[PDB]
């Protein structure tokens, strides 16, 4: 084991701007590192070699510093096309293990989510399972908390989220939420909330039904 | 110029034995180290192994050591990956890539000779899951009592994938589809979702598309407020 840990863990920027991305290793490696370019859906593009080389056919605003513990790889005006996950790699030493990645999104002014809450169809109740679904619409930063409470009763473990690709327009994310129950369940209690908590929100917003009216 | 060929997406059963293959063409088969990458869906890349070839010399990554066998063929230029006992965890996209060389070899390789994955193949697809092939239930996701969001959501189907229009594709605007999850219960399921103005709740009639062609489904669902 040499381990590679990568910071910032993800990286919001604008068009022009100069990034930086920095690999530290548990362990003096030398130049013995490469940086690769993953974009969703496709196989990692080799950039960088030997901490300091560039791979033919990279763009030269792409650029490796460093040696030893300490390794950089510069951005100096972001393109559209550089908005991928970055991943360094040590190879000193086999397993030639990969850090763990840096996303670099875009950057955009804060917006708050649109949250709307879906009962289980009746259709759906046939089955013997329920599915209540809470939706986050168009917020910006990616990071949000939701939680389900039933009852009152805080819900965990029986709950899954699932997050769309930045959109390529609005560079926003949407959310589903969605807490899974057996019919029984389902039956036997009356109120259902999503609560969400996000930055551009002062206060956290609840949406929900009860299920009697 | 070089190119990396892998064999397509499997869906095995936890237990089953798989091999996956990895043909290559544009250079000699037997004289570069070449190797296999593991992503699991969502998550960075997990270095499995090496094998040169030429010599048959494999270096494996200890988490890996006794769980999969990486094996060539240099008869026909084609680099295999296999395990005996399949497991839910090995889910996961597998690259094989070429690991090739970038520098001088001076002092006999021990300086400025360095390592790096430059071509990589397309990747296979691996699905583990004790579901049969399934097609999917639809259920409605309606609107509330000036902007709404009404839906569909697919459950439980399998092997993925679904695809999902509205109204035939007379509306895109504002559709979300999100990735499908992977549930307990071995099969798919996802949500797709649409805003619009509440005024057109009356005057507009919202329809699901929903599409599993590895079952044959082609579902239709209105979505009616109350
Ligand atoms: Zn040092
Ligand atoms: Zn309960
Ligand atoms: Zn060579
Ligand atoms: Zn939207």
């Known amino acids: 084991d040499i381990q590679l840990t990568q910071s910032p863990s993800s990286l919001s920027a604008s068009l022009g701007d100069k990034v930086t991305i920095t690999c530290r290793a548990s362990q003096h490696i030398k130049k013995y590192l490469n940086w690769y370019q993953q974009k969703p859906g496709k196989a990692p593009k080799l950039l960088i070699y030997?901490?300091?080389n560039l791979q033919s056919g990279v763009p030269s605003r792409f650029s490796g510093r460093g040696s030893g513990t300490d390794f950089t790889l510069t951005i100096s005006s972001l393109q559209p096309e550089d908005f991928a996950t970055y991943y360094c790699?040590?190879?000193?030493?086999?397993?030639?293990?990969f850090g763990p990645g840096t996303k670099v999104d875009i950057k955009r002014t804060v917006a708050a989510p649109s949250v709307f809450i879906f009962p289980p169809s009746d259709e759906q109740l046939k089955s013997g399972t329920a599915s209540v679904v809470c939706l986050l619409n168009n917020f910006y930063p990616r990071e949000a908390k939701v939680q389900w409470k039933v009852d009152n009763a805080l819900q965990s473990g029986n709950s899954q989220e699932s997050v769309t690709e930045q959109d390529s327009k609005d560079s926003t994310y949407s959310l589903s939420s969605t807490l899974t129950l057996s019919k029984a369940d389902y039956e036997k209690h009356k109120v259902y909330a999503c609560e969400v908590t996000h930055q551009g929100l002062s206060s956290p917003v609840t949406k929900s039904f009860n299920r009697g009216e | 110029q070089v190119q990396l060929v892998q064999s397509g997406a499997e869906v095995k059963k936890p237990g089953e034995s798989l091999k996956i293959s990895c043909k290559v063409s544009?250079?000699?088969?037997?004289?570069?180290?070449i190797g296999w990458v593991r992503q699991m869906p969502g998550k960075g890349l997990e270095w499995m192994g090496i094998i040169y070839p030429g010599d048959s010399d494999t270096k494996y990554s200890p988490s890996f050591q006794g769980q999969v066998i990486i094996s060539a063929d240099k008869s026909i230029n084609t680099a295999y990956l296999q395990w005996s006992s399949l497991k839910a965890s090995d889910t996961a996209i597998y690259y094989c890539?070429?690991?090739?060389?970038?520098?001088?070899?001076?002092?006999?390789?021990?300086?400025?000779?360095?390592?790096?994955?430059?071509?990589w193949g397309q990747g296979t697809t691996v699905t583990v899951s004790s579901a049969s092939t399934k097609g999917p239930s639809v259920f409605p996701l309606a609107p509330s009592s000036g902007t709404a969001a009404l839906g569909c959501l697919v459950k439980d189907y399998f092997p993925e994938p679904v695809t999902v229009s509205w109204n035939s594709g007379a509306l895109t605007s504002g559709v979300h589809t999100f990735p499908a999850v992977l549930q307990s219960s071995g099969l798919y399921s996802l949500s797709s979702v649409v805003t619009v103005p509440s005024s057109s709740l009356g005057t507009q009639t919202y329809i699901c598309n929903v599409n599993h062609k590895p079952s044959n489904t082609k579902v239709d669902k209105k979505v009616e407020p109350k």
């Open positions: 790699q040590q190879s000193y030493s086999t397993p030639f293990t």
């Open positions: 030997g901490a300091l």
């Open positions: 890539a070429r690991q090739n060389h970038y520098g001088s070899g001076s002092y006999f390789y021990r300086t400025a000779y360095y390592y790096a994955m430059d071509v």
């Open positions: 544009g250079y000699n088969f037997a004289s570069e180290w």
